[PDB]
Amino acid sequence: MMTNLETRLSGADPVFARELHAQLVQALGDVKRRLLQQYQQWQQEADAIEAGLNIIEKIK
């Protein structure tokens, strides 16, 4: 049921965890400045990234 990811975010791999979080925000910044039609697509992507950031915290 549980993934390998969940166990790497639960404290067993502190470095992995902050690298993943780091790039997820990196990416978020990319699409956010991209958003300054085709906005609903990027906005959809911004939601997805932010969503992942919400889970990583709810399961760390």
Place this chain on the structure above:
Amino acid sequence: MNVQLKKQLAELALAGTGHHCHQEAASIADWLAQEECMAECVTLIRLSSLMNQ
């Protein structure tokens, strides 16, 4: 963003469906849906979300 990161978000979404994070998983699912190569991927996430709700 890049495929490797995307797969990490999908796994993250799948993990989320098992932690009462259906809204987050849905947001991820619909974005991945934008791609054709992730069909089944979004399928499972959604099916996992449907079964855990």
